[PDB]
Structures are given as C-alpha cells and as structure tokens.
Amino acid sequence: GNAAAAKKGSEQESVKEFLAKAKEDFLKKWETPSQNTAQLDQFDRIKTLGTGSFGRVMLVKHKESGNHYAMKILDKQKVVKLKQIEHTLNEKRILQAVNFPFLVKLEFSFKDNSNLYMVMEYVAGGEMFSHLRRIGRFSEPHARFYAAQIVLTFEYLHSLDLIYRDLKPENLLIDQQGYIQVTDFGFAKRVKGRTWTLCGTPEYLAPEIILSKGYNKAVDWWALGVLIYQMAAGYPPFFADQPIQIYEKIVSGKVRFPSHFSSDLKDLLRNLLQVDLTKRFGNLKNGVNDIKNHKWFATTDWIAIYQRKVEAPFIPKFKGPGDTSNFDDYEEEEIRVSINEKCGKEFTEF
C-alpha cells in the first residue's frame, strides 16, 4: 500500500529491468549472429555420444579450458538431402542469441567444407518423454514443479517476440539437477502479430493453428495446458489414431479430466485449454500473471524456481556408477572433412 506496494513495484520494475536487458542482449546477437566462434582443432575428441540421420553427437574437451561439451556434427549434404536447411539455420540462430536457465546452451559454433558444428554445453540426463512413460504419471506437486519452469521460459521467450511452436515431452530434458532444459528450436519463430504456418505435433496444436486463420503467441499457452495435462494424467488430453480426428477433438474443445485432478488443476486447465484464444489465460490483459497467480500455482516460489533453489522431484541416475549397464555400443569412426566446400551456398548464414 505504501512500503508493501512499493515493494512489489520495485520487484516488478527490476523484472521489467531483467527482460529489458535480456531483450537487448538478444536483439544484438539476433540480427548479427556470431559465426565460427571456434575451430575443430581446438577440441579433443573423446568419444561418440550417439548419432542420427543428420550427423552425430560427440563428447569433446576444450584443449585450453578443459571443459567438456556436446558437439553435434551435421553433414551439410545430408541436412540438404533431408531438407532441414531452414530448420537448422533457424535453430542455430535462435540458440546463439538466446540465454535463459531452462533453455539449452550453445557454447561455440562453426563449420567447414563438410559439416556444421554446434558445441553444446555438456548436459547429463534423460528425456522427459521417457521418464513420463517410466513413472507413468506425475503428482500435481511434481507436474507443477515442471510446468512452473516452462511458464517462466515462455515468459522469457515471449518477451523476445519468439513463438515456440513445438512444446512436447520429447523436446524437454531433465538435467543433473532435476531441472528442465528445452532443446529444439527449429520451429521457433520471431514474429510480432500473427503467423500462419502449420507445424508441431498434433496432440499439441492449438485450435487456431489447425483452423488456419493465423495465430499468435497464445498457442504456446494452450500447449502448456496440453503438457500439464499429460504430466498429471499420464496421457495427452486429445488423442486419436489419425490426425484429422485429433483436430476434431481440439477444435471442438471438449476435454475429459481425470477424477484425481484437484479443482485448481481442472480450473487452470480450463483457462489454458481455451479454444477461444481471446479468452485464454496468458493471452489476456495480465499476460503471464493470470497463470502465475492462479490457485494451482499458489505454492510456487517463482524466483526460487528461476534460481533452481527448489528441490527437484528427483535427480537422473547416471552419476555414481553403472557397471557397464549405463552405456553400450556406438560408432567409433574418424571425422573426415573434405578439401572441397560442400553445400557452401545453402549454409552461408551459419
């Protein structure tokens, strides 16, 4: 009212301060992305941490610093064959301009005649789609713990005019501290106003997207609704063996809530899974505050969550031992870059 109100105002003003600077740091790196901020001979190739149809992820150690990083290698030719050029260039650009705790960290970036390299911060943990399948279902307090980090992440990402059209368990990963870290921005897009492209997994598409009349940031909030639901239920709200059918369920908008769902959870979800974006929480007059201040989040210490000072509902197993059972079988071939540039034109911006 006096000191009490002034307390909030100051806190609010500092947040306004945090996003303001963050927005500036981002804009800089965004219209003038860093390039070839490292070289291949600066790293010590330890071992293969896995592969893909694009290239392979390799564990490496910086010769000067001693730090380890996850270096994913991408064969430009394969990337082009698979038609992931735009996707890849986009993700690398967002990743080098972005910066937030629950967002994956790109440490270095470069490319040569043969590949595109992304030296990622070494993270140790599993996927969140695997743990959900394992645990089966999360308790409301646990689901809240995650949803809370997601909320902050979109608050950040939204303040940047970025729309993450790809929320889903597969894109989320739990780290060694038990906190979330979003990994995948190929679909993300910087846009003020609305955009029309249809992308993202079916069970997560907001009504407006499938309705093809354009859509804005509000779809991530609807997606937060789908995630939360899936965590607390064990399965997604809208499902069908064929996409078209899932669309019908989404656009219709008739959800079925598990009976173990607390009233608050049922209430929050009703306002997040709002078919009418104009009445959807997060896309209203109080923005993210309608979400943060909801009853279901009443016990959430946003600042603490942000600072990872809340105890994770559990920490991933991989530290302490394993007995060979933790890992096994991977391709151990050498890296051979050409003497002739490949797909030089397509990846000029990288």
Side-chain angles (χ1 to χ4, degrees), residues 1-132 134 136-316 320-322 332 334-350:
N2 206 162
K7 214 255 198 176
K8 284 183 171 180
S10 177
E11 293 180 303
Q12 289 186 294
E13 195 83 62
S14 299
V15 174
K16 195 186 170 191
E17 191 181 314
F18 174 69
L19 285 327
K21 305 175 183 181
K23 177 62 171 295
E24 186 45 55
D25 181 58
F26 165 83
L27 264 33
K28 240 53 192 180
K29 306 172 185 177
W30 182 248
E31 223 67 56
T32 310
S34 41
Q35 288 163 291
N36 281 36
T37 57
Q39 289 175 177
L40 220 201
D41 68 5
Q42 304 181 187
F43 300 89
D44 230 89
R45 336 195 174 154
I46 308 294
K47 75 182 175 185
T48 306
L49 295 175
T51 67
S53 54
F54 51 112
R56 79 173 157 169
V57 184
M58 184 169 297
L59 170 61
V60 301
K61 176 183 298 203
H62 196 274
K63 292 179 183 182
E64 298 301 289
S65 78
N67 296 298
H68 294 78
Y69 308 93
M71 182 179 96
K72 54 169 60 172
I73 309 173
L74 285 66
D75 178 343
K76 284 184 279 175
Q77 296 184 305
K78 294 178 181 174
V79 189
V80 164
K81 198 88 307 70
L82 298 173
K83 307 179 173 182
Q84 296 296 66
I85 305 180
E86 29 284 310
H87 302 271
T88 311
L89 290 183
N90 187 237
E91 179 167 68
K92 177 280 179 167
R93 185 185 179 184
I94 284 177
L95 280 180
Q96 61 78 49
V98 129
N99 187 66
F100 197 65
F102 316 120
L103 248 35
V104 141
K105 242 288 295 303
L106 179 72
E107 213 66 75
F108 298 112
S109 165
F110 61 78
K111 41 66 176 297
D112 51 35
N113 292 323
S114 293
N115 314 293
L116 306 181
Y117 305 69
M118 293 206 250
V119 193
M120 236 67 204
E121 182 198 75
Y122 169 80
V123 169
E127 171 199 61
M128 210 259 254
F129 177 61
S130 292
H131 263 295
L132 185 51
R134 207 190 320 305
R137 160 161 71 88
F138 297 138
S139 72
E140 299 212 3
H142 284 173
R144 179 178 303 120
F145 174 72
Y146 295 129
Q149 298 163 65
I150 296 300
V151 179
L152 290 181
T153 285
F154 288 156
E155 176 184 15
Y156 168 69
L157 254 36
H158 284 2
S159 75
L160 255 43
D161 307 293
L162 281 174
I163 298 178
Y164 193 77
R165 302 91 82 71
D166 213 27
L167 182 57
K168 68 187 181 186
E170 298 82 327
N171 289 339
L172 301 172
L173 71 87
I174 318 298
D175 60 45
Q176 270 298 303
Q177 182 173 168
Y179 279 74
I180 296 177
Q181 205 150 173
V182 184
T183 175
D184 233 299
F185 305 86
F187 282 167
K189 181 186 180 197
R190 180 109 197 294
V191 26
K192 289 183 171 184
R194 62 289 180 56
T195 171
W196 286 251
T197 20
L198 194 169
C199 62
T201 292
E203 23 278 296
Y204 280 77
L205 305 189
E208 54 269 51
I209 304 179
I210 97 90
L211 245 44
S212 296
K213 255 61 177 62
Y215 66 80
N216 65 166
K217 64 170 67 165
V219 301
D220 288 337
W221 291 132
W222 160 288
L224 200 226
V226 181
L227 176 67
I228 297 178
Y229 182 110
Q230 186 179 160
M231 289 187 275
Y235 52 96
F238 313 91
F239 196 68
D241 304 323
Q242 240 52 57
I244 176 65
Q245 304 168 298
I246 291 182
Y247 296 156
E248 275 149 46
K249 285 183 179 295
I250 295 179
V251 169
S252 106
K254 206 80 168 190
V255 190
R256 209 66 266 165
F257 293 124
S259 56
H260 53 93
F261 277 26
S262 59
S263 298
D264 294 337
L265 179 54
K266 295 159 71 185
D267 186 273
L268 175 62
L269 253 37
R270 288 176 179 140
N271 289 103
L272 284 172
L273 302 183
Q274 231 319 306
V275 294
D276 175 307
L277 77 92
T278 79
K279 308 213 168 190
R280 184 175 307 153
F281 269 31
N283 187 246
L284 267 43
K285 173 179 56 182
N286 308 275
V288 71
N289 287 169
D290 297 313
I291 295 180
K292 288 188 194 172
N293 291 309
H294 187 284
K295 275 294 187 181
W296 195 75
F297 280 109
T299 66
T300 300
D301 189 329
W302 301 96
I303 297 68
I305 289 293
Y306 176 68
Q307 311 181 307
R308 305 172 202 273
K309 291 180 173 178
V310 173
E311 83 144 0
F314 88 75
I315 299 189
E332 291 293 61
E334 290 291 329
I335 298 180
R336 191 282 187 157
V337 301
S338 185
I339 52 174
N340 300 302
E341 177 179 286
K342 304 282 178 289
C343 318
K345 170 173 59 185
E346 299 89 329
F347 303 106
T348 301
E349 294 185 358
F350 194 95

